[PDB]
T-cell receptor, first 244, second 202 residues
Framework: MKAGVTQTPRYLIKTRGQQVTLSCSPISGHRSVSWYQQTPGQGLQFLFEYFSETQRNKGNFPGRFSGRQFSNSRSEMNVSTLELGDSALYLC????????????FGNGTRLTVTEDLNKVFPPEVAVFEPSEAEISHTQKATLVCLATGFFPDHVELSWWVNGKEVHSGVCTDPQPLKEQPALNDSRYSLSSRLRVSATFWQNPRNHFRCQVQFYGLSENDEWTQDRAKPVTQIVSAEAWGRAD | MKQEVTQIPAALSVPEGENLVLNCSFTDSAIYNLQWFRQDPGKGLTSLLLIQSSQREQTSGRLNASLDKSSGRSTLYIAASQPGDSATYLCAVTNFNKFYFGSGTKLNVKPNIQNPDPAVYQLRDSKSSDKSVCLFTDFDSQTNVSQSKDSDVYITDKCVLDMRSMDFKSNSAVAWSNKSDFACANAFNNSIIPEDTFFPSP
């Protein structure tokens, strides 16, 4: 009910040389706002902290990384002259007082910097219905959803059964697999499973949907390729239960 | 002096129910607080414990952390581990004018599979896809899933699902390909799988 730390935007794809501005709103009543960069290669690294509209502490980033804080404690950070290695999760944390009170993190802004927007592809999404042998041997039925060929890794996969989001019986891979592990802007694949009882699967009225939200190009990004512009979109696949 | 935060082990796999120990060390003892966090994939961090520089320990639930400031050490003890403890655990210290995070411990707490029933199943093709898909499922948690010998066969790692209203958990791995010389019989040939694994006739 009470809002936690909020961050906007959620996802960004930029080309080299561009700039971005990110915003964070602290928990109500928190006044210390901190920014961190998380990369696979360098881990979580401190950018800077703000309190009462001024920078209180700073990390070791070059001057093209900048910040500010408004009178209502909202904070922005900016990155100019973007480079590939700036691809990261940009996390903000709020605290009542960072010296003696816990840090509370947002969920981050995921930034991917690419050489070329022609590298960006939405997922193809498919559902694969259960094995007959699984149903006879176990009295259970596993559906698989595959999301493939996407770049960047800005996807959210969810399952819906009769219109209600489910978590019971689900497992989605924690990370995607690189389809060509040696290339820096390789496309990705992701799998997920939804397991239900045989009885549930055997009812043709039951409806199963695998949803993938993909966060892609802005309406302000130019696009001159023949293929469809890889905008933010949902790609989905579905199945209905089946008797014997 | 230069602060360095070290966490070990980098990765820990353990059976549910076991106690766990997470280590954090810092070379500059002049800190104001030490904090432990968890991070789930796809998410930000969640504060678990904050130990002030004047305190020797903090407890919440099954978590207890000690701080030995002069020795430059903290230990996080997790009692009676649960699958929902699986996460990356981060140690941070607050210095006079800087903040420093360790590289983390990636914790995986594996479920005990009461009645393993290892099998490799073929899923139905989709009319809207060109992939062939195979499911290795219901194996016990000591089984390791390897990558294929083939660069165009894709295999995920074991993922645990929980059918809550049936009190049932199971492991699975997915394999797929769109090459034609590919079959579920051979999909997991690069893995050491149970000798009693069920291969239904196609």
């Amino acid at each position: 009910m009470k809002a936690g730390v909020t961050q906007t935007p959620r996802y960004l794809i930029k080309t080299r040389g561009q700039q971005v501005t990110l915003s964070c709103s602290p928990i109500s009543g928190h006044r210390s706002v901190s920014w961190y960069q998380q990369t696979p290669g360098q881990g979580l690294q401190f950018l800077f902290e703000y309190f009462s509209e001024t920078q209180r502490n700073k990390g070791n980033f070059p001057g093209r990384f900048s910040g500010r804080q408004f009178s209502n404690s909202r904070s922005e950070m900016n990155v100019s002259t973007l480079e590939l290695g700036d691809s990261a999760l940009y996390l903000c944390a709020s605290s009542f007082d960072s010296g003696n009170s816990p840090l509370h993190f947002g969920n981050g802004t995921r930034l991917t910097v690419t050489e070329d927007l022609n590298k960006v592809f939405p997922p193809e999404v498919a559902v694969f219905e259960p094995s007959e042998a699984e149903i006879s041997h176990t009295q259970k039925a596993t559906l698989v959803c595959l999301a493939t060929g996407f770049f960047p890794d800005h996807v959210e996969l969810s399952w819906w059964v009769n219109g209600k989001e489910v978590h019971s019986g689900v497992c989605t891979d924690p990370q995607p697999l690189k389809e060509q592990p040696a290339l820096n802007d390789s496309r990705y694949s992701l799998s997920s499973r939804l397991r239900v009882s045989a009885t549930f699967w055997q009812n043709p009225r039951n409806h199963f949907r695998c949803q993938v939200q993909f966060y892609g190009l802005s309406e302000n990004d130019e696009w001159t390729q023949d293929r469809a512009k890889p905008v933010t979109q949902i790609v989905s696949a579905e199945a209905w239960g089946r008797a014997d | 002096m230069k602060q360095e935060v070290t966490q070990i082990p980098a990765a820990l796999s353990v059976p549910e129910g076991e106690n766990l120990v997470l280590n954090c060390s810092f070379t500059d003892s002049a800190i104001y607080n030490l904090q432990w966090f968890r991070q789930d994939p796809g998410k930000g961090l969640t504060s678990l414990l904050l130990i002030q520089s004047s305190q020797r320990e903090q407890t919440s639930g099954r978590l207890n952390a000690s701080l030995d400031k002069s020795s430059g050490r903290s230990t996080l003890y997790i009692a009676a581990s649960q699958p929902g403890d699986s996460a990356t655990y981060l140690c941070a210290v607050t210095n006079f004018n800087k903040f420093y995070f360790g590289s983390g411990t990636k914790l995986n707490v594996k479920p005990n599979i009461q009645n393993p029933d290892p099998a490799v199943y073929q899923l139905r093709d989709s009319k809207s896809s060109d992939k062939s898909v195979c499911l290795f499922t219901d194996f016990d948690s000591q089984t390791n899933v390897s990558q294929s010998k083939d660069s165009d066969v894709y295999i995920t790692d074991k993922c645990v699902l929980d059918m809550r209203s049936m009190d049932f958990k199971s492991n699975s791995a997915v394999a797929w390909s769109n090459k034609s010389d590919f079959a579920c019989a051979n999909a997991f040939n690069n893995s050491i799988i149970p000798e009693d694994t069920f291969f239904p006739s196609p």
